[PDB]
Amino acid sequence: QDSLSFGFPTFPSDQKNLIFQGDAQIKNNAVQLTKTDSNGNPVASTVGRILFSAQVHLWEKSSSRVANFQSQFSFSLKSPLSNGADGIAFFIAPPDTTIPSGSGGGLLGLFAPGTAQNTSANQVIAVEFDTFYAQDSNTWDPNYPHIGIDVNSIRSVKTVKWDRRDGQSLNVLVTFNPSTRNLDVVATYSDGTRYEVSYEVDVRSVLPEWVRVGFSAASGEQYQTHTLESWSFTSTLLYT
């Protein structure tokens, strides 16, 4: 289809169109990307992702069209630790994408350690909300919590300073305009605090014509829950 749209105001336990990978699962009408014990407390060494089952037609070589898409979602992070890790990401990848071996911790379940910074060995666009930046392990990160745009590498092509707020929902709108090739990110907390970051990228040179979209999160030595609360997505092929 040239256009596809779906909306999850909440996530009831009865799901049919979500692909669950790793430890991801539904609890209390929300998606818990990373594992939690019986008490609902976060635990270390966990990775989880979800993808919508239907494939998205991102662009079409035969007609020179590229999709205009929007992804709106909200999530919250919680941890008893002073440095909860590692973060959550909205991503776009080839339909057959699976969790790479050893992609936990700072790799967010998106990259393998051996090629995490080799832009030639990956095919993924992701918007990350990174809460762990120890300069000793996450050597690629700026020294502060941040929102980042990742294009084939865990070393973001761009980041902006972000404030982690325990237990508070962050609302995010990610949009891509094929005319300007601008990928825009706007995130806000309920008190009006706003974060914005934009990057120009030709998706045709990074991803295949058909892709799958979803979320990924992970915790290494440090942990926190990564709870996806809602998600709506829409894409339509346009002439350029």
Ligand X SMILES: CO[C@H]1O[C@H](CO)[C@@H](O)[C@H](O[C@H]2O[C@H](CO)[C@@H](O)[C@H](O)[C@@H]2O[C@@H]2O[C@H](CO)[C@@H](O)[C@H](O)[C@H]2NC(C)=O)[C@@H]1O
Of 3-11, 73-81, 106-114, 120-128, which segment contacts ligand X by CB under 6 A? 106-114
Does 79 sit near ligand X (CB under 6 A)?
Answer: no
Instruction: Provide, rounded to whole angstroms, the least separation between the CB of residue 179 and Ca ion.
Output: 32
Q: Which does 72 bind (CB under 5 to 8 A by kind): ligand X, Mn ion, a copy of itself, none?
A: none
CA distance 72 to 233: 6
Task: Report in angstroms how near the CB of residue 166 gets to ligand X at its nearest.
Answer: 16
The counts of H helices and E strands in the chain are 0, 17
Structure tokens given for 80: 């008893």
Reference 235, options 200, 198, 210; nearest CA is: 210
**128 annotated ligand binder:** yes
Report residue 158 as tokens. 């761009």
Q: Which does 141 bind (CB under 5 to 8 A by kind): ligand X, a copy of itself, Ca ion, none?
A: Ca ion
Return the residues of window 119-148 that contact Ca ion according to CB under 5 A: 130, 132, 138, 141
3-class DSSP state of 22: strand
Q: Give the integer Cα–Cα distance in Å for 148 and 162.
A: 9
Q: How many residues of this chain bind Mn ion (CB under 5 A)?
A: 3
Q: Which residues are annotated as a binding site for Mn(2+)?
A: 128, 130, 132, 141, 146
